[PDB]
Design a protein around this ligand. Sequence first.
Ligand SMILES: Cc1ccc(C(=O)Nc2cccc(C(F)(F)F)c2)cc1Nc1nc(-c2cccnc2)nc2ncccc12
Length: 275
Amino acid sequence: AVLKFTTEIHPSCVTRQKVIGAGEFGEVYKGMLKKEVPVAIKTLKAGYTEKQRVDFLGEAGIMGQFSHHNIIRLEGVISKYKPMMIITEYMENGALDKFLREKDGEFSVLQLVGMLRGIAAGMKYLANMNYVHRDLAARNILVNSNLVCKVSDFGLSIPIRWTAPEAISYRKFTSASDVWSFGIVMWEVMTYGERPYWELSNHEVMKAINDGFRLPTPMDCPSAIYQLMMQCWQQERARRPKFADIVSILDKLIRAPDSLKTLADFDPRVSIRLP
Ligand SMILES: Cc1ccc(C(=O)Nc2cccc(C(F)(F)F)c2)cc1Nc1nc(-c2cccnc2)nc2ncccc12
């Protein structure tokens, strides 16, 4: 019953080619699905525990439930044969963090903001479906050949720098802690994948947040975008925007693109004196 919105795939339709990650109890592969379509394949290999099986099929079950442009698509599952597999689409451009770092300065502000709107729309969908992501970060977002961002969860995780204070302090993970994370993702996108808080240690990051410091504006960043990410980082959880608010604002900014021409002041760490 866990697999109501999933398609069962026969093993003869799947070819694994190269290991591209690790799972809870199995290896993630790049592969092909049957013209042939590229896929990512997470396996659950012999010896898995009862809890691992419940978690693995549960993951497939929730993923099949999601049908949205900005959420990774489940192609299907192999549950009747061993090893069991979860099969998703494969996005040629890979994960957003590495993508932006390899394409520094190559996109327009409107393109970057459009990526954030797509991420926000996927997260609005997840929150409305009563799913808390808990690990929203550019490393967990895939990019397709139309620049469409798809929220995913590669399970490689607490990511302190992305996590709201209440989730760190007392393990309260909600859609509002995912909003804090989204604000960090906005900063990642607008900086082309800079490391949040740079070289500060995890303890230093938490101390800075608790003392009220926040990440400074990225270079070339629209004022409205920095204002929005700053409101995602409010200490009081109830004061943060909901994802519906975020989607609404980003859609309005995109539809009136002159709104993005007003840039927030950048604080220069270096000064160069020239005549
Ligand atoms: C096979 C597979 C299984 C599950 C997931 C996944 O995103 N699961 C998941 C679980 C809970 C919630 C969500 C949510 F909500 F969509 F974000 C997704 C992703 C994948 N696909 C993957 N694709 C890719 C990948 C890499 C490069 C290009 N295209 C896909 N890498 C992966 N690395 C590690 C683990 C899984 C990877």
